[PDB]
Chain A
């Protein structure tokens, strides 16, 4: 049978599935179809968040049923970029953010262009193509900003 999985972003995603399949199973299909990891996926039917260990059957989901998909919104921290005078500015970032776009966030917050930004961590100057994760920045941390 077919069911429909509607994203909050407006895309409707159609899925071949059987009445006794698990919520885990459905998630895996969605991953294969759209590349969203299952641990990020929250499936909802009739206002009810659907639990991993139960079946479609268990929530009375049938032929032509539409499900809602929303993504988990994980967070926890903010890095700090300090100047030498002691002034601090905070940024929201992921480990996978490039140094380029950390600078781009600094251009967006304060006025400064990335060409004029020297970012330092653990005494090392940070190179634009690398990520924060390359430099083992995996939670709230302190970078130094020096001006060029």
Chain B
């Protein structure tokens, strides 16, 4: 096991038939982070629902372990997951259609595994609502940090964290395929949630991106500024009908360099002058994912 097993052509989760929403979110969530590892480990309890075990076993044993030891997962295994998904929610295109990661997270975490809600929020002084991720919503600076968006979205609905989340997935402010509130967003490397708690820090570990119809992923695999990878479950294709896709994972240290710059410096930079894969991280963010700090060394 090692970084270099993860990197290359024919690495990551092989996409197949509109699967990129699923491939990329699983890659974000499990390629390097362990924030949700327990979800793959909690024993079946009597309150668990029908496919609990088959699903857990599939994720751990045929998806995540191979991803982590071999650097690669065949589309057949994802397709097995998608069928289970479709059996839990029929006629919702889980085996063939473009979907939202939100849809995927909710069926998987809420219905099948029965993950305790990741976020507990109180529209302040009211009582708590449960969710798995947070939607930035607010009224239209040109390049905001995700720190600002979270603060602004919280103030806009008078919200607070009921308790400190371990895994905070934040959805960027977009309205369909055709509208982005912001042309570029600065994904804060660290989030300070102190002034948003009822009663401190979190570290960026992934960004799930999409320009209009294909999801890809950026992942932070170490504390170093340059320790970023990019994953496309459909980087290349072989064949025609019975053709198959070739996923790719690539080092993208430039991301680290652009995130040493300020929002206003990035704002002045034309997206066509942004190098490597960094353009997509800065312009196409869909979800930013934060965890209880494990990679960092406090100083």
Q: Assuming A47-B134, A92-B213, A140-B245, is B123 touching A77 (CB within 8 A)?
A: no
**Residue A68 at the chain B interface, CB threshold 8 Å:** yes
Do the beta carbons of B173 and A75 come within 8 Å of each other? Answer: no
**Residue B286 at the chain A interface, CB threshold 8 Å:** yes
Q: Assuming A47-B129, A92-B213, A93-B213, is B234 touching A78 (CB within 8 A)?
A: yes
Q: Tell me the residues in window 187-231 of chain B with beta carbons closer than 8 Å to chain A beta carbons.
A: 210-215
Q: Assuming A9-B179, A46-B157, A47-B157, is B135 touching A73 (CB within 8 A)?
A: no
Q: Assuming A68-B137, A77-B214, A78-B20, is B159 touching A46 (CB within 8 A)?
A: yes
Partner of B137, one of A70, A72, A75, A92: A70
Find the A residue at minimum CB distance from B126.
Answer: A46
Range, interface on chain B: 35 or more
Q: List chain A residues, Cβ under 8 A from B140.
A: 10
* A71 to B180 Cα, complex, angstroms: 11
Do the beta carbons of A140 and B213 come within 8 Å of each other? Answer: no
Number of interface residues of A (CB under 8 A): 30
In the A-B complex, the 10 residue pairs with the closest CB atoms: A76-B18, A46-B123, A71-B176, A76-B98, A78-B214, A48-B129, A74-B98, A8-B175, A72-B100, A92-B213
**Residue A125 at the chain B interface, CB threshold 8 Å:** no
* A22 to B88 Cα, complex, angstroms: 23
Given contacts A47-B129, A70-B173, 19 further A-B contacts (CB under 8 A): A42-B135, A46-B129, A47-B123, A47-B134, A49-B131, A70-B175, A71-B176, A72-B103, A72-B176, A73-B174, A74-B21, A75-B215, A77-B15, A77-B98, A78-B213, A80-B237, A140-B237, A142-B240, A142-B243
